[PDB]
């Protein structure tokens, strides 16, 4: 009947809404570090750096 792939398939407006939230997840991070009133961040690693 359906596709017999062993992975995962998502069609329609599901991925069309997921790619915007994937791009907005990156833009909402770097929005606080733009312009002369922007502020720096902290990038802490698992090893402690």
């Amino acid at each position: 009947g359906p596709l017999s792939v062993f992975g995962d398939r998502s069609t329609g407006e599901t991925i069309r809404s997921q790619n915007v939230m994937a791009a907005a997840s990156i833009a909402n991070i770097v929005k606080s570090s733009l312009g002369p009133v922007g502020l720096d961040k902290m990038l802490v690693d698992d090893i402690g750096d």
């Binding site: 009947g1 359906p2 069609t11 329609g12 939230m21 994937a22 997840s25 909402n28």
Partner: protein, 535 residues
């Protein structure tokens, strides 16, 4: 993303959303058709007189071989909500008419298979559903063209027998195809109220006992109960029975409240012995003063009352059921008496040969009522070689009792064997061009799905579907359309009027009406919100 927001917060809408299943897509309609076609392909092989039966096993290990479409889909463990609606579709045909429970599932799966190719062309699913309503309306009006019956329930039982042979021809009762067909005709006409056109199936008792053969099934005018003569020396044959039906146990009268009767002296204890000794002589004499020679009691008997039955020559049965004695008072014309003091000669029942019959080596000894006087209650005694052939004959003959009931509700008939489906398919194709504005493709998908039922009869009979259907459909256009179908041994010609394949009008009228509305509820759905695992 799912279960997380773009700001890092957890995104939870409903509870346990990770173990949910939701499909809107374009395959949500495709999953409903592939689940419904597999039910229709299962029921396709059990259609017609050459339809092969199915073996159903219950959860307890009991095996029942069924052929009717109502009991097949009901005894499944299908956990699919689209196929569960096909179970209630075959149940709705059994509750209303009760003859086309197999054909209403193949027709519903045929409308969804033709709608699959219409869905890929870009047609809206409600536009197909609105096109099926305008196409099924033509099939209802065309089915009422040729319809006539001459049943008078006096001597013209010949249209009634041939109507029941169409229903019993597909079951396993074809060895008794003439004997058992006449049983279901006379069982309805003796209990039906022709002034109201109402038939009550509570008056038709269907009992079964293993032993004998299928040819030993007789229509017993009366009642058949388990006889429980408390005395083993009771006479087992009454020639003329004045039946005294009572609902009081043969005992001293016990009240319904708490009494705690007090005994003080020895004169009160000797009064206890004379009270019960005169009570058992009063309950026996009040039956003999009415002239009765047979008693029926719902409750038990006392040991002191058992020997008083033999001294007065009064046979009596013990521990009869609730609705069983309700059938005795109608078959014998008597009245059910609450007490013993209200017994009279007018409340007695009349019966002829009252006897018990032992079946082989068992100890059942069922009641056989041969003679009666204007009874309104009959009992069919189904015998067979095993319990598989009896429980199926209880389901096969019940479909034969329903098609006679539908003739009293509506005295119009059609001709089966695929003759009515080909004639209705030509009516939709003629009105598809008047006018082919929007719903031209939806009406032609209805006419191509109406031809699945006669081409399934050609497949089960060993013929070719597209070769036999093209010959029958072309002969109805070149001349005026007769009752032209098919058969298994084909009986020579293909004329259904000569082969006496007669079906009810309202049977096929509800086959097209219920399958169209069930298709509309499974086409007008674009989401599934089923859960995941059980726990």
């Amino acid at each position: 993303t799912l279960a997380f927001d773009e700001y890092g917060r957890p995104f939870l809408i409903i509870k346990d959303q990770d173990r949910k299943s939701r499909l809107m897509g374009l395959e949500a309609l495709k999953s409903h058709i592939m689940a419904a076609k597999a039910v229709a392909n299962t029921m396709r092989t059990s259609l017609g007189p050459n339809g092969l039966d199915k073996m159903m096993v219950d959860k307890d290990g009991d095996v029942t071989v069924t052929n009717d479409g109502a009991t097949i889909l009901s005894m499944m463990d299908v956990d699919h909500q689209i196929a569960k609606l096909m179970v209630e579709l075959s149940k709705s045909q059994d509750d209303e008419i009760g003859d086309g429970t197999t054909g209403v599932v193949v027709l519903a799966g045929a409308l969804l298979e033709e709608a699959e190719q219409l869905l890929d062309r870009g047609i809206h699913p409600i536009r197909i559903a609105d096109g099926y309503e305008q196409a099924a309306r033509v099939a209802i009006e065309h089915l009422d063209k040729i319809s006539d019956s001459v049943l008078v329930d006096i001597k013209d039982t010949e249209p009634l027998i041939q109507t029941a042979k169409t229903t019993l021809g597909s079951k396993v009762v074809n060895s008794c195809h003439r004997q058992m067909a006449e049983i279901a005709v006379n069982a309805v006409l003796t209990v039906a109220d022709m002034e109201r056109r109402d038939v009550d199936f509570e008056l038709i008792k269907v009992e079964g006992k293993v032993g004998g053969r299928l040819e030993d099934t007789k229509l017993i005018k009366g009642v058949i109960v388990d006889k429980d003569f408390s005395h083993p020396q009771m006479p087992k044959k009454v020639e003329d029975a004045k039946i005294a039906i009572l609902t009081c146990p043969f005992e001293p009268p016990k009240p319904k409240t708490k009494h705690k009767l007090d005994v003080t002296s020895v004169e009160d204890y000797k009064a206890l012995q004379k009270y019960e000794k005169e009570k058992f002589e009063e309950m026996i004499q009040q039956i003999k003063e009415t002239g009765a020679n047979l008693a029926i009691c719902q409750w038990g008997f006392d040991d002191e009352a058992n020997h008083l039955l033999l001294q007065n020559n009064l046979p009596a049965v013990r521990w009869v059921g609730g609705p069983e004695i309700e059938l005795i008072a109608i078959a014998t014309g008597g009245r059910i008496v609450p007490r013993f003091s209200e017994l009279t000669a007018e409340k007695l029942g009349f019966a002829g040969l009252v006897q018990e019959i032992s079946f082989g080596t068992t100890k059942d000894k069922m009641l056989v009522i041969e003679q009666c006087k204007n009874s309104r209650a009959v009992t069919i005694f189904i015998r067979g070689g095993n319990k598989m052939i009896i429980e199926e004959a209880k389901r096969s003959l019940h479909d034969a009792l329903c098609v006679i009931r539908n003739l009293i509700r509506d005295n119009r008939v059609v001709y089966g064997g695929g003759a009515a489906e080909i004639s209705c398919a030509l009516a939709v194709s003629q009105e598809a061009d008047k006018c082919p504005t929007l719903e031209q493709y939806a009406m032609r998908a209805f006419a191509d799905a109406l031809e699945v039922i006669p081409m399934a009869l050609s497949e089960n009979s060993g013929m070719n579907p597209i070769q036999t259907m093209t010959e029958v459909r072309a002969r109805q256009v070149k001349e005026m359309n007769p009752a032209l179908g098919i058969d298994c041994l084909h009986k020579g010609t293909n004329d259904m009027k000569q082969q006496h394949v007669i079906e009810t009008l309202i049977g096929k009228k509800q086959q097209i009406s219920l399958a169209t509305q069930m298709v509309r509820m499974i086409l007008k759905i674009d989401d599934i919100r089923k859960p995941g695992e059980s726990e």
